[PDB]
Amino acid sequence: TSKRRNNGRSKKGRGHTQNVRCSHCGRCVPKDKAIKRYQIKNIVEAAAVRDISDNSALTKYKLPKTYMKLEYCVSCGIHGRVVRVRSRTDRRNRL
Amino acid sequence: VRVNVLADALKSITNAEKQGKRQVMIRPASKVICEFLNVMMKHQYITDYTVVDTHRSGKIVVNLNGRLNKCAVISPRFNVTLSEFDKWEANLLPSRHFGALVLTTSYGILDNTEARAKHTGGRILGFFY
Amino acid sequence: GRMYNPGRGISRRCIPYRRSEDLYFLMRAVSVRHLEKNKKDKDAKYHLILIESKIHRLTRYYKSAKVLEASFKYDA
Amino acid sequence: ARGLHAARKMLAQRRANKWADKEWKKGKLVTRYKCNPLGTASHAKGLVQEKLGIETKQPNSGIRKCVRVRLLKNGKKITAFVPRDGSLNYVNENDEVLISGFGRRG
RNA sequence: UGUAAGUUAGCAAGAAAGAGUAGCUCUGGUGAUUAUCGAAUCAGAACUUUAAAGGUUAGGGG
RNA sequence: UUGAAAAAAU
RNA sequence: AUCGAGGACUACCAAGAUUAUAACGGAUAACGAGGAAUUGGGGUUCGACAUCGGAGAGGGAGCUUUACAGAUGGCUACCACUUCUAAGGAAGGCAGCAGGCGCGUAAAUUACCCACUUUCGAAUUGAAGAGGUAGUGACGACACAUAUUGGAGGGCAAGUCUGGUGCCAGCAGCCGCGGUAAUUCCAGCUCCAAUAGUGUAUAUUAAAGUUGCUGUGAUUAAAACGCUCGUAGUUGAAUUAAUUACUUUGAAUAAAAUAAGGUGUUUAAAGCAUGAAUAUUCAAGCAUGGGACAAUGCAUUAAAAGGAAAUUGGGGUGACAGAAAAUAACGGGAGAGGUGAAAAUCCAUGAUCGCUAUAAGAUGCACGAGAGCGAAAGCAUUUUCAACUGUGUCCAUUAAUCAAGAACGAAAGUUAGGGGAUCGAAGACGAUCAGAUACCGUCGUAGUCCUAACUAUAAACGAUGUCAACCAAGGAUUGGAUGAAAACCUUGUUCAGAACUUAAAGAGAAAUCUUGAGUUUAUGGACUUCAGGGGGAGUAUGGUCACAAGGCUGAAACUUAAAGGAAUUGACGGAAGGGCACACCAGGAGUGGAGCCUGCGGCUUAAUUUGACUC
RNA sequence: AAAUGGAUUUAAAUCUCCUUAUUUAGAGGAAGGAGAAGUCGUAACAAGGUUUCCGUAGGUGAACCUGCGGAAGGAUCAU
Numbered sequence A: 001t002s003k004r005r006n007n008g009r010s011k012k013g014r015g016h017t018q019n020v021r022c023s024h025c026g027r028c029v030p031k032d033k034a035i036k037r038y039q040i041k042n043i044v045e046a047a048a049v050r051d052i053s054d055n056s057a058l059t060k061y062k063l064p065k066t067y068m069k070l071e072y073c074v075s076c077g078i079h080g081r082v083v084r085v086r087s088r089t090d091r092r093n094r095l
Numbered sequence B: 001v002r003v004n005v006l007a008d009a010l011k012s013i014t015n016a017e018k019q020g021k022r023q024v025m026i027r028p029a030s031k032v033i034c035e036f037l038n039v040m041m042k043h044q045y046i047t048d049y050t051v052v053d054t055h056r057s058g059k060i061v062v063n064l065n066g067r068l069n070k071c072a073v074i075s076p077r078f079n080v081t082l083s084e085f086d087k088w089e090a091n092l093l094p095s096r097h098f099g100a101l102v103l104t105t106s107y108g109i110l111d112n113t114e115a116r117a118k119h120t121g122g123r124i125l126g127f128f129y
Numbered sequence C: 001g002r003m004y005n006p007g008r009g010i011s012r013r014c015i016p017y018r019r020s021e022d023l024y025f026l027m028r029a030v031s032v033r034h035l036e037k038n039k040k041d042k043d044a045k046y047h048l049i050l051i052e053s054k055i056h057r058l059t060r061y062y063k064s065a066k067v068l069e070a071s072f073k074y075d076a
Numbered sequence D: 001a002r003g004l005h006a007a008r009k010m011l012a013q014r015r016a017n018k019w020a021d022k023e024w025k026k027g028k029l030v031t032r033y034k035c036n037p038l039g040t041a042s043h044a045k046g047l048v049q050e051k052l053g054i055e056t057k058q059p060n061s062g063i064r065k066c067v068r069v070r071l072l073k074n075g076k077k078i079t080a081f082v083p084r085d086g087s088l089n090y091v092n093e094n095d096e097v098l099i100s101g102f103g104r105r106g
Numbered sequence E: 001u002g003u004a005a006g007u008u009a010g011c012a013a014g015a016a017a018g019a020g021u022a023g024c025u026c027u028g029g030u031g032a033u034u035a036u037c038g039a040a041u042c043a044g045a046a047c048u049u050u051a052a053a054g055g056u057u058a059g060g061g062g
Numbered sequence F: 001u002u003g004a005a006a007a008a009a010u
Numbered sequence G: 001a002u003c004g005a006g007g008a009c010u011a012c013c014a015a016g017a018u019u020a021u022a023a024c025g026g027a028u029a030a031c032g033a034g035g036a037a038u039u040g041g042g043g044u045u046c047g048a049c050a051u052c053g054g055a056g057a058g059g060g061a062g063c064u065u066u067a068c069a070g071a072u073g074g075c076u077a078c079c080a081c082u083u084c085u086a087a088g089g090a091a092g093g094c095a096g097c098a099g100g101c102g103c104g105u106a107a108a109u110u111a112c113c114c115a116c117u118u119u120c121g122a123a124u125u126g127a128a129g130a131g132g133u134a135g136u137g138a139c140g141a142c143a144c145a146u147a148u149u150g151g152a153g154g155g156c157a158a159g160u161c162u163g164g165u166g167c168c169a170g171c172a173g174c175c176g177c178g179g180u181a182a183u184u185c186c187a188g189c190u191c192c193a194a195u196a197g198u199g200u201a202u203a204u205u206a207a208a209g210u211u212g213c214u215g216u217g218a219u220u221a222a223a224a225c226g227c228u229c230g231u232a233g234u235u236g237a238a239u240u241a242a243u244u245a246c247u248u249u250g251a252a253u254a255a256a257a258u259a260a261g262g263u264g265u266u267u268a269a270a271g272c273a274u275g276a277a278u279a280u281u282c283a284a285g286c287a288u289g290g291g292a293c294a295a296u297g298c299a300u301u302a303a304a305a306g307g308a309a310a311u312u313g314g315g316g317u318g319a320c321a322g323a324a325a326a327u328a329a330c331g332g333g334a335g336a337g338g339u340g341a342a343a344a345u346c347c348a349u350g351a352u353c354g355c356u357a358u359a360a361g362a363u364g365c366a367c368g369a370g371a372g373c374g375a376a377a378g379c380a381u382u383u384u385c386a387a388c389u390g391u392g393u394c395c396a397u398u399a400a401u402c403a404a405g406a407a408c409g410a411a412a413g414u415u416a417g418g419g420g421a422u423c424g425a426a427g428a429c430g431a432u433c434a435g436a437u438a439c440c441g442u443c444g445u446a447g448u449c450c451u452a453a454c455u456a457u458a459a460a461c462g463a464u465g466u467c468a469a470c471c472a473a474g475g476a477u478u479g480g481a482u483g484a485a486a487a488c489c490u491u492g493u494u495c496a497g498a499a500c501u502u503a504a505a506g507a508g509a510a511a512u513c514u515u516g517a518g519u520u521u522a523u524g525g526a527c528u529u530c531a532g533g534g535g536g537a538g539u540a541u542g543g544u545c546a547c548a549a550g551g552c553u554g555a556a557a558c559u560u561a562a563a564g565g566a567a568u569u570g571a572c573g574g575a576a577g578g579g580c581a582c583a584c585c586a587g588g589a590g591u592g593g594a595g596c597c598u599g600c601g602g603c604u605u606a607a608u609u610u611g612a613c614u615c
Numbered sequence H: 001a002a003a004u005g006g007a008u009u010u011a012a013a014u015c016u017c018c019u020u021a022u023u024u025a026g027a028g029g030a031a032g033g034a035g036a037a038g039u040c041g042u043a044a045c046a047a048g049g050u051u052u053c054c055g056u057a058g059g060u061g062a063a064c065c066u067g068c069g070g071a072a073g074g075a076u077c078a079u
């Protein structure tokens, strides 16, 4: 019958939540049904972080970080290996 | 809303004994609720009770000892003719020596064992095993 | 529980254990009929229907108590 | 609708809820006297028009000999199963043949 | 008095169909001024005859 | 990136 | 006027009568009752026909005689029939007893007698196709000589017998048996059930707890209205030391019959040869003992019933931001969009890219959560209503559910204006493909936005109706009240709200549910709606609403042994994770190319013998 | 007291408008169902190779495709 107890989404006391657009395929997916991941990445990768410091006109310049929040749908959330298929008794894991 | 105060009272006692509770509380206490417990005390299905005075139809505490099996109310009280007793005993009761119906008659509240002797009928309130 | 909203409050006064208008206050219906300025306030239109039936419920009962003569009729 | 004085809703509910069965409803619609070729009759007499052979269903195979019979009371056409092995020869054209139902009711 | 199908819901419609209509003698209703006065209009009842829109004007219908 | 079909009954 | 009351009729007067508690109308293959078939209780089906009442004599209509007839084995007229005839005319009503034709699956003798029961008469006698006997009579019922029907794979008793047929004939109510070794066909032998019986087709009942008050189901099998308001209806908290209902009795209550009391028709079916008190009467009605529970309206309370008179609220209505695109000016001179790869397209009139400005359209990220509000639909920039809590405030049953009826009701869709930036049903190109009229790329009308008026459907979903009482353990959250810790943060008690973890317990067919899908064969708290195997089919017709598309109500004819629900194993995946193989990578030798040995297919022949056909 | 004239009452039978039931209508038109091996495609059941389905609108030999919104009975109860 019900493969999930909360029907995949995470809404209980509300009858409607605004749609959002998936970051990969651009598919209209609800706000709670979406897969939300918060990415913190330096603009200069670790293979080149020391390259800047050799020739930097400043003195104590600290390289900033990129702050983007990605929302995926199930169709490319699974396909993108963000999440996987879990066991029936291992589905309840929420950590 | 509260349609039958007796109906909610009896199910409280039936559920309490299924959980092994020693005494249960029934917030309302009508005349029939107290009278019904008197019928179940002559058969020794309960030891005793009390009627707390709250000025708003105070609660009743029923002392029971693992003896009541199923006490239930009956939906709108059917007119039980004296000749119709055998119809209800064969259905509502487990055996001819165990169950005890409860009836209301003009001579007061009576059970099926004694109302047959008094030679009267009337409506039916419930039963208890 | 409440008559219309499915909320169940039990807050009460408790008159102690010792012994030692409502129809008029509902005519809220006048205050809502605010309706003229905001004709698109569909939420106030629904809530006004509930209040109108509340008054039409005390009228039906107060008449049987002879408090109001049987010619009483509520019109705005 | 359990109330003691509510004996009209329960009766009206059963009158309404009884019309949804496929079996008793056939006993109150006027279709047996109208659409049933037999009507309320046990047997139907008729006249032979055509000899036809119906192949069996998917799991089985073979041709079932049959005859198209036109009744004398209604004039309708009904296909009839010739009873036994090699018994299609016994029947002829334009002769009285008795037609009486089958094992399944109606 | 009654009036169908269809319909753009307005129309079809005077749809179709049926009853009455004369003459004489009466009665009642519709107002102004404080009993008098004025208007053609509607309704009803007796009695009689040659049974009544039709001298002229004056839709045939489906 | 593309990738269609497998005659009925035992 | 009639024997008789009365709109039964007449003249006048007033507008009155029924109606959701089903009026008026429609169908019956409807004469009603006593009763019959079948039932564990409850019930369902039938009843023209023994007896009572009703109606009719081909169809109404009108009358005669008489105490009672609207008489029909009496009369008349008309409509439709039949019989004789001298061609001028005449009578007849078999739905009386036999009998004839038709109708059909379907039903007896054109007999005798008033002897039994009874009726009529001028009355002891006369009459009776009423009545009795005889005749046919496998509708049925009882006792009983010693012979058939169907079957022998499972339900269901019986063959591991032999010949034929070779998915053909055929058997089979259902599941199926038969494509050359039939437990099922056509046959030969045997025994299995019943026995004057036995197969067949239709209909009634029980099984059917598949019509459900006793007695069903509504998350997933079929089935909870999208939600709320609301009249009829049903159901309505405690408390008191004139009717009606309820309950106990009687009276009267047709027989036959139901169960029988008695009675050796030889038993029995029968029969009443003392007549069982025989009990019967459901529904109604009459008199009566009692008023617990109850319905009707002229004096107690203050219900974790209801309603009325400090905070919370993306609850409803009205009156800051830069992204994408456009425009303008400036820099730069060659590509830019796009894809797995490309192309159609834009660009030397200067594209893409970079800074700065301008106007409208739309949008409301991050904060944004199994958090909040809202009856549902839904609600996200800042600057009238609903609920909870507090309450020694007021009323006193005002209450719950609700046919009919009404409000709100995503998106798309219609009509008329404004707006028309982004995306984009139809459509146009470019790709891919065997084709592609689709997924992929570019462009683009309707639409997407606001106003006003419509439409009223959704996976309108928690597939779980509304109100009410009990209900194991635990963490945590939103808004209040009360203490300590001195608006926020930590903690205790308690009310309301959205949820979550465990259960060795309860339920279920299982998944699962526990703020029920628990308190249910130990079955009844109150109310409303829906469902009865799958198709046909939410189709036709009818009704109604809408500018329209369409919505609401909504069958049958016919067809078929399955359709469907939850879980187990296996297999499969152009699903994932973990390992392995000359499977592949790095290579060597090659085969395929040439002549020849040999095997295979094909052609050929009198025969060119045959098995094997991816690993 | 018989024929017969007339006026009433009850009125059979018949003609014109007015609803329920049964039929004829040809092939006619548009539906539906059933019958072992008949064509064209791959739409659905695995991520069925474009996740499926519901309402609505358009298109198209055919399954069906696409736009707006919804649902998991999804392939996510999860950062």
Ligand SMILES: NC[C@@H]1O[C@H](O[C@H]2[C@@H](O)[C@H](O[C@@H]3[C@@H](O)[C@H](N)C[C@H](N)[C@H]3O[C@H]3O[C@H](CO)[C@@H](O)[C@H](O)[C@H]3N)O[C@@H]2CO)[C@H](N)[C@@H](O)[C@@H]1O
Binding pocket: H035, H038
């Ligand atoms: N049943 C009505 C409808 O039939 C439709 O389809 C119908 C036909 O188009 C379909 O025909 C199938 C065909 O699909 C398939 N590719 C070949 C097959 N032989 C056909 O079969 C059909 O026709 C043959 C003709 O001799 C008959 O022998 C056979 O019994 C019959 N089923 O069989 C169905 C019945 O004839 C759809 N299945 C559905 O919409 C619906 O079921």
